[PDB]
Design a protein around this ligand. Structure first.
Ligand SMILES: Nc1ncnc2c1ncn2[C@@H]1O[C@H](COP(=O)(O)OP(=O)(O)OP(=O)(O)O)[C@@H](O)[C@H]1O
Ligand SMILES: O=C(NOCCO)c1ccc2[nH]ncc2c1Nc1ccc(I)cc1F
Ligand SMILES: [Mg+2]
Length: 289
């Protein structure tokens, strides 16, 4: 079925973020609850038909680790992307309530991100471009899925920043970047969720005892490109997890681990084996089921 503006009805607002707001909506003709992302674009009518045409590949983006797609259209000054409602929300939301995310839980998350990036790369030849906690969504059936990845090339162009960057050193320094940049983003996201806060600048020894002003924009970006990469703090995390994120955060992107290597890493093999009620932990910490 084709999706269209007057067939919808706002239930609530799921949140906002720099460009679009997303609503929990009811598609009246189907009865389905969806998440409708609206993106305001003051843009000519020729190229907003190309954006919709290129978003149609999301119908073939079927994966347990990728947020489902219902359809896309253009309304009155905004392009709508309609997707699976994830009732657990994004991992930046669950991090606020949880304080930290346990290491065993981040094992299941890491697996999901690797397998989702791998799906997008192998089957659709695209990189995410925007891996961070807010773009990793979870639900009460225990599924972990990626969204807001760069399918339509034209859509990226029409939106071309924020106080916290998950961009790799190489991407910050110029156009010389590709799929390896997503690895860096994931690594930083994992350190953040593990520790309970954005890991740049790194916490001093006294701030690490308490756990276990904000930087200016240039000061922060200068740290990412010129200062050594964030480490997972020793002792409280396993040696295999520390190595995992260290391989993800190697400044040199060719020296840095790629998806193939991370898939067979000791941390992933171990987390594959582990028995985790992720559904039960997720609902327990945010109050749902
Ligand atoms: N499919 C969805 N189901 C449930 N909640 C969603 C869904 N998509 C987005 N959200 C929620 O809406 C919020 C806003 O999302 P949006 O993509 O517009 O910005 P963001 O990713 O949070 O931040 P930024 O724009 O800087 O990347 C997210 O934090 C998330 O909690
Ligand atoms: O929403 C995007 N960014 O988040 C900022 C909004 O404030 C975004 C950006 C660039 C993009 N190119 N192709 C798509 C696309 C995209 N959305 C998107 C992609 C996959 C799914 I499943 C659902 C989506 F909504
Ligand atoms: Mg987003």
């Amino acid at each position: 079925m084709e999706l269209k503006d007057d067939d919808f009805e706002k239930i609530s607002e799921l949140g906002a973020g720099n460009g679009g707001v997303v609503f929990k909506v009811s598609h009246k003709p189907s009865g389905l609850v969806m998440a409708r992302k609206l993106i305001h674009l003051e843009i000519k009518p020729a190229i907003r038909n190309q954006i919709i045409r290129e978003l149609q590949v999301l119908h073939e983006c079927n994966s347990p680790y990728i947020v489902g797609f219902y359809g896309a259209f253009y309304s009155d000054g905004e392009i709508s992307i309609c997707m699976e409602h994830m009732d657990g929300g994004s991992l930046d939301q669950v991090l606020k309530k949880a304080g930290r995310i346990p290491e065993q839980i981040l094992g299941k998350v890491s697996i999901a991100v690797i397998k989702g990036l791998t799906y997008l790369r192998e089957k659709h030849k695209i990189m995410h471009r925007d891996v961070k906690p807010s773009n990793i969504l979870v639900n009460s059936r225990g599924e972990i899925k990626l969204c807001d990845f760069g399918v339509s090339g034209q859509l990226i162009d029409s939106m071309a920043v924020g106080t916290r960057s998950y961009m790799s050193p190489e991407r910050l320094q110029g156009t010389h970047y590709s799929v390896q940049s997503d690895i860096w983003s994931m690594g930083l996201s994992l350190v953040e969720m593990a520790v309970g806060r954005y890991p740049i600048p790194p916490p001093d020894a006294k701030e690490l005892e308490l756990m276990f002003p904000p930087m200016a924009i240039f000061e922060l970006l200068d740290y990412i490109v010129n200062e050594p990469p964030p480490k997972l703090p020793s002792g409280v995390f396993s040696l295999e997890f520390q190595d995992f994120v260290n391989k993800c955060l190697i400044k040199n992107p060719a020296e840095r681990a790629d998806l193939k290597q991370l898939m067979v890493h000791a941390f992933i093999k171990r987390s594959d084996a582990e028995e985790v009620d992720f559904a039960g932990w997720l609902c327990s910490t945010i109050g749902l089921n």
